[PDB]
Write a protein that binds this ligand. Sequence first.
Ligand SMILES: NC(=O)c1ccc[n+]([C@@H]2O[C@H](COP(=O)([O-])OP(=O)(O)OC[C@H]3O[C@@H](n4cnc5c(N)ncnc54)[C@H](O)[C@@H]3O)[C@@H](O)[C@H]2O)c1
Ligand SMILES: NC(=O)c1ccc[n+]([C@@H]2O[C@H](COP(=O)([O-])OP(=O)(O)OC[C@H]3O[C@@H](n4cnc5c(N)ncnc54)[C@H](O)[C@@H]3O)[C@@H](O)[C@H]2O)c1
Ligand SMILES: NC(=O)c1ccc[n+]([C@@H]2O[C@H](COP(=O)([O-])OP(=O)(O)OC[C@H]3O[C@@H](n4cnc5c(N)ncnc54)[C@H](O)[C@@H]3O)[C@@H](O)[C@H]2O)c1
Ligand SMILES: NC(=O)c1ccc[n+]([C@@H]2O[C@H](COP(=O)([O-])OP(=O)(O)OC[C@H]3O[C@@H](n4cnc5c(N)ncnc54)[C@H](O)[C@@H]3O)[C@@H](O)[C@H]2O)c1
Ligand SMILES: CCCc1ccc(Oc2ccccc2)c(O)c1
Ligand SMILES: CCCc1ccc(Oc2ccccc2)c(O)c1
Ligand SMILES: CCCc1ccc(Oc2ccccc2)c(O)c1
Ligand SMILES: CCCc1ccc(Oc2ccccc2)c(O)c1
Lengths: 257, 257, 257, 257
Amino acid sequence: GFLDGKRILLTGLLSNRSIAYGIAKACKREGAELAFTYVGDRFKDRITEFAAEFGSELVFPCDVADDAQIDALFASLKTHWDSLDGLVHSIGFAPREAIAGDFLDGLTRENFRIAHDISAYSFPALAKAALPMLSDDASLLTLSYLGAERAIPNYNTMGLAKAALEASVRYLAVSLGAKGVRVNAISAGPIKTLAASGIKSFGKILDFVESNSPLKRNVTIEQVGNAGAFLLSDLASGVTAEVMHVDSGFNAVVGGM
Amino acid sequence: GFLDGKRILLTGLLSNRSIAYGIAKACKREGAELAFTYVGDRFKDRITEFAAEFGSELVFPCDVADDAQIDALFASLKTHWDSLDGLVHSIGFAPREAIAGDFLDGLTRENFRIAHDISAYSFPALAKAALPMLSDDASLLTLSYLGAERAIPNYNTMGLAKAALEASVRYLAVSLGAKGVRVNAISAGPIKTLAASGIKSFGKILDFVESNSPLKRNVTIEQVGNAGAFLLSDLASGVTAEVMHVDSGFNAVVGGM
Amino acid sequence: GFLDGKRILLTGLLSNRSIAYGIAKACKREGAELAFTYVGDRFKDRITEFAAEFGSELVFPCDVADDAQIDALFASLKTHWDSLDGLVHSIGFAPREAIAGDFLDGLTRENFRIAHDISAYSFPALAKAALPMLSDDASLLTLSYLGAERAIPNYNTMGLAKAALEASVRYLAVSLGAKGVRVNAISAGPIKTLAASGIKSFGKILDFVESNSPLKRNVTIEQVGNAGAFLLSDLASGVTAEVMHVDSGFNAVVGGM
Amino acid sequence: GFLDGKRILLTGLLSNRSIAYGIAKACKREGAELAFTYVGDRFKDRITEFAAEFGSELVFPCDVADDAQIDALFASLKTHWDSLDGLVHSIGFAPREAIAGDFLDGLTRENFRIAHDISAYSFPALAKAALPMLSDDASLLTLSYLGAERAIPNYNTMGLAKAALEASVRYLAVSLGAKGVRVNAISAGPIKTLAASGIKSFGKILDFVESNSPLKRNVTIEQVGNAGAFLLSDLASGVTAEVMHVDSGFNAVVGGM
Ligand SMILES: NC(=O)c1ccc[n+]([C@@H]2O[C@H](COP(=O)([O-])OP(=O)(O)OC[C@H]3O[C@@H](n4cnc5c(N)ncnc54)[C@H](O)[C@@H]3O)[C@@H](O)[C@H]2O)c1
Ligand SMILES: NC(=O)c1ccc[n+]([C@@H]2O[C@H](COP(=O)([O-])OP(=O)(O)OC[C@H]3O[C@@H](n4cnc5c(N)ncnc54)[C@H](O)[C@@H]3O)[C@@H](O)[C@H]2O)c1
Ligand SMILES: NC(=O)c1ccc[n+]([C@@H]2O[C@H](COP(=O)([O-])OP(=O)(O)OC[C@H]3O[C@@H](n4cnc5c(N)ncnc54)[C@H](O)[C@@H]3O)[C@@H](O)[C@H]2O)c1
Ligand SMILES: NC(=O)c1ccc[n+]([C@@H]2O[C@H](COP(=O)([O-])OP(=O)(O)OC[C@H]3O[C@@H](n4cnc5c(N)ncnc54)[C@H](O)[C@@H]3O)[C@@H](O)[C@H]2O)c1
Ligand SMILES: CCCc1ccc(Oc2ccccc2)c(O)c1
Ligand SMILES: CCCc1ccc(Oc2ccccc2)c(O)c1
Ligand SMILES: CCCc1ccc(Oc2ccccc2)c(O)c1
Ligand SMILES: CCCc1ccc(Oc2ccccc2)c(O)c1
């Protein structure tokens, strides 16, 4: 398939409901060879299974909060893979206050810092840290959300991280485009994942979108998985710096009238 | 491949440099079954060859300026294909004055009318005219340009057609999304085609883009072809109402500084 | 005030609820000198009153559908005013089918043509037709709507006109910016006017916006009037090609969740 | 004038070339009553003059890096002013590496943190910290740049801060819009200020924009000053969550072809 022989490092695979999960399936299904990351020694076992399920024996710890691990990650990886062809950044986090209720009520220098550190900075951070072993046709891909461009209830500080993340996509594309590397983001629709547990009335949004999206249905990690494989592949060799909505077209309407 | 067994009607195939040409290759290459259109009886012979080259024997006249032919087109087609799975609208035109030099100098109620009739109206026109035989996973795809969103020298009235075209994409996605139909547009970078002959200093733009695009190179009909196949395919089953830039990332920078 | 001595031609003044009405008040209130247009001989009397109410004795017929009247308009005007300092385009229209119910159900080559002729073409049409007597600090201003950028129920074909109109703003700004002329558009929120009678469930939208706008209220022609004066004024001497939302911030949220 | 009797706190006034300077002039000129901030005890003297020049005797230290001073600021201010009617955030900063040369070359967890802390977080930070004494017609205004939406050479990490800042504008508008408070940003064109010294080839950009802007000229702090007075005033009572370009229309074109 269109990923035959491509070596892709996937982050953010946590459950079988993870967006990163559907992207692994879609990649494996297209010939890709995969490697994975996890956070903390207490997940080391779960990711090892998941990796086995995709014929991979490569699992690496990486707390994107630690310069040390990010650097360790690519040193380790280097001994197994000669070069890297794809990196998937499926990483987000915000203190629980910062994504609950009133925007200003959850705001503090600390929450802001953390949400931006982990959800925004980490993406170009990993990029700089892969630059060395990246290939010439290589493709980076990150996940984002409509909340970066429009005020969504409860999203709050996540909204700002995501705006910064999407700006980094553009600055990455320019920085790495010289070397033939492409950088893109997918803007996904609401999908019930672990991370999604912290968005109160997530159920309200999900229902709303199913009512008003042009396609009148919710998206799935397979749909998102499928678009990602594309962007990671050479079919998308003319596509860099894009932010691609995959949300049954929801961004495009004004719903509920 | 990801288009196995899909039946796709392609318009705007004129030369072997046409965008519609690269999209046919990409589709055929992915298992698609193709049908084509042409304008005027004096091209009837050329399109028949082209169709042969993609294992097709289906060629149909269609001047999108004529309600008659647009209707004839889908009546004819109906006797061969039971249903339609994909339609590609690769059609643009503007009187030569309207895309030369000063915007206001080429402006006249007549030019405006024509450019909008042919380049914009025709897309949803064809859609209404296919609605009857369209399938449930069907996908519509049109071509557009960055000049719809930013003032490009010489583009002029084409700029306005293209803004209207892109708006129709959204209204189409809503109208047809109920029936499971997806509608999308690709925003292509500068490609030396016959239509591109009418843009003076097209050579200036093309050179500029090659200098300043993040990927530092120009796009090709194969790159555009490849993205189109994707959008026409069920890989993009979560993607509707999108306008997808395929231009080495050019929209995303500010060049020449 | 900030319009002292500026001579401004206003179109689209039909009732005392018209957007063009609130812009006249705001302009007069700021020292402006006004002139007005009307359509058909059977409104000649109403506009004459309205003009009196703003200390003006200048009323001119102009069916923007007729090259003749558009030209007559500025010939006439020229004998009274030596030069023009501001033009307000407050003109929209679409056959009733084209803004009712299903998008595709109201679509016909004829409706499309008409809505685009009157709502879109007319703006740059008038501009070319004023170019001769326009001054160096002159400012053009048109009205638009959020339906140009996102699919709104019932808006339909008006959506496409408005996208083309907004593109013309950019091409105008480039064309006339050389001569010091500025061109801008205001994107207004829902306001109960005569034109708004043709949007079924306009009452539904208006209520929705009042519920979900960040400011939690609907806009008024005075609010729109006030922004327009600004754009027409030399306060906005650094502002061209802008599309300025004036809608209690509605474009910026995702409502109803 | 349109700011008669309004009490506005201005930050970021550093030189007579400051953007905040032109906004003070424009505000004073329209009837406003002003108060100012400064950073560090070694500027205490300069701001005191500047404040005298606008008939103000209110100057307050505020390192937006310190929770302490931000809180002190509004406690102090409270004893002089009963309530606040306008706040201007004219604050930006990034380590010199982060805005020099290659994006990835200037990237470090620390630079990112700092640029986001000072340029992005500080705006809603100040807002929460003013909420108590803010009035019902109150208006917040921040400064931003086109680099938030498109990759500009050298801007780099500033690009991301600015994207986050502009997202905060939307989330602010929603949070404070309930209480009648409006929140807006101005996207300014290149202006030779102290902060602008750190952008290498700033002179290249400034020249480029003067060549290609629709108005064919650069903007000035008076032009920006004038737009800001507007947004701070009740003329803009229908305008919240907007990001208003003031850049001779530069965002709207594609230059250099
Ligand atoms: N759920 C949705 O609807 C949705 C929509 C759009 C985007 N997203 C985005 O997609 C991404 C994935 O979220 P998800 O929905 O698949 O939920 P998920 O929980 O399955 O994925 C989140 C991942 O973030 C990882 N992560 C958190 N902190 C980390 C750290 N300090 N270092 C490294 N990794 C860390 C978690 O381990 C987890 O694997 C996120 O970036 C999120 O913003 C989710
Ligand atoms: N080269 C560029 O960078 C570029 C970018 C974006 C979109 N396009 C678009 O793609 C399409 C074609 O591009 P192209 O470069 O191959 O131009 P092309 O001239 O080489 O081919 C386009 C085809 O549209 C045809 N056409 C004209 N009138 C028609 C009608 N009434 N009915 C059906 N077809 C008609 C033309 O004759 C031509 O065959 C157009 O829609 C154009 O707007 C070109
Ligand atoms: N209410 C809304 O929310 C809203 C929002 C944005 C823009 N508008 C726009 O502002 C303008 C008018 O709004 P309105 O609410 O006052 O509608 P209105 O009907 O109350 O007044 C608009 C005027 O345009 C006039 N017009 C029609 N054909 C004309 C022609 N050939 N030449 C000159 N004028 C003509 C109408 O007759 C009417 O007098 C239109 O451009 C419309 O698109 C309305
Ligand atoms: N120069 C331009 O072309 C331009 C264009 C668009 C936006 N801007 C933006 O406008 C704002 C003002 O910049 P400027 O161009 O007027 O230059 P400026 O130097 O005159 O203003 C910058 C201000 O930021 C202040 N500041 C820096 N660190 C601070 C801190 N730790 N705490 C509080 N205040 C601090 C400085 O004291 C200074 O007063 C910035 O936010 C900038 O991003 C500048
Ligand atoms: C609103 C649903 C969309 C969405 C859901 C979950 C998301 O994942 C999060 C959310 C907050 C913090 C960390 C990760 C997300 O980015 C986007
Ligand atoms: C730089 C030229 C970009 C471009 C070239 C050809 C294009 O196709 C045309 C051109 C003119 C009229 C109608 C359709 C186009 O849309 C855009
Ligand atoms: C919710 C309605 C918004 C709206 C109302 C009236 C408007 O003015 C019209 C309406 C229909 C046709 C032509 C011009 C408008 O543009 C937008
Ligand atoms: C490129 C010119 C536009 C611009 C110039 C100076 C600016 O001010 C800065 C820049 C970097 C760090 C801190 C403040 C700015 O935001 C935007």
